[PDB]
Structures are given as structure tokens and as C-alpha cells.
Amino acid sequence: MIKRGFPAVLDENTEILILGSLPSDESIRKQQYYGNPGNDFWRLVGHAIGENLQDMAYEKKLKTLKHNRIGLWDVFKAGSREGSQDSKIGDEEINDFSGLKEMVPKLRLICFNGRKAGEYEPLLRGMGYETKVLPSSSGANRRFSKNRESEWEAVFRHLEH
């Protein structure tokens, strides 16, 4: 099957909009990023905002993000990530970001989770918004990127002062 993204997890007050690349099918079966707990995102952001997202139920950890002025979304609305040789995102169905100025006027930093997301960084540098290519929060990168989560802390600590 084609991997389908999620509707924007957004508040009218959002300083940082985090665009992943293409949500994992394990996420999509639950229809939740937390659907696979290997997304360490909740600890990476959680230590930075000082509020443990991990132990909160999915609805509440999102409420906490809206509180800290964080929104969640993706780049690829639909992409083919299937069992093949290359296993590359073929399908080119991508979200509109010309509307970012309407949906997020408080937006200052667009955090791209994973390389595939961060390839579309120079696109959103045209929207007058600062852009940061964060690495993938998934377990695949987690096992290697231990001290790299310190840059995540530098991002979300500002959300108070």
C-alpha cells in the first residue's frame, strides 16, 4: 500500500511547525505517530519542553505540544515506501506550504524530521520562515544519535524564554 500522511496537528498559536517526511505504516495503522513507540520524538521534545510527552496518552501529549506552541505534520501526503530493492519514496503527493503564513503566523522555525523532509528545506526558506533539518526521531537513527538530541533541546527550550 501507499503510505498516507496525517491531518495537521496544529493550534492557532504555534511557533514551531515540525514537518516529518512520510509517516511510517506502523504509525498509519494506529493513525498516530506514537503508534510505533520507536519514534523517540516524544522524549527529544519532552526533555526540551520539560514535560514528559511519553507517559501522556496520545491526545494529552498533543495538548502539551499545542501549549508549548508546537504543531506536527509531514511533507509527503502520500509516498510509496514498500518492500523493494530501492524502497525510495516514489509517489510525489506533497502538502501545500504556501498556506503556512495563514495556518501558522506565529511560525518562526520549520523543523524537518528526517533527510527526505529536509530536502524540501530550500522550498520553505522562500516563505520567510527559518528552517532546521532535524534528523529522524525514529529508532533507526536513535541507536546512533545520542548527543545529537542536544540540538533538539536548543530548539524547544526557547518556547518559554
Swiss-Prot record:
Gene3D superfamilies: Uracil-DNA glycosylase-like domain. Excises hypoxanthine, a deamination product of adenine, from double-stranded DNA. Acts on double-stranded DNA containing G/I, T/I, A/I and C/I base pairs, but not on single-stranded inosine-containing DNA. Also has minor xanthine DNA glycosylase activity. Lacks any detectable uracil-DNA glycosylase activity. It comes from Methanosarcina acetivorans (strain ATCC 35395 / DSM 2834 / JCM 12185 / C2A). Belongs to the uracil-DNA glycosylase (UDG) superfamily. Type 6 (HDG) family. GO terms for biological process: DNA repair. This is Hypoxanthine DNA glycosylase. Keywords: DNA damage, DNA repair, Hydrolase. InterPro entries: Hypoxan-DNA_Glyclase, Uracil-DNA_glycosylase-like, Uracil-DNA_glycosylase-like_sf. It comes from the Archaea. Disulfide bonds: none annotated. The active site is at residue 39. GO terms for molecular function: hypoxanthine DNA N-glycosylase activity. It is an enzyme of class 3 (hydrolase). Its EC number is 3.2.2.-.
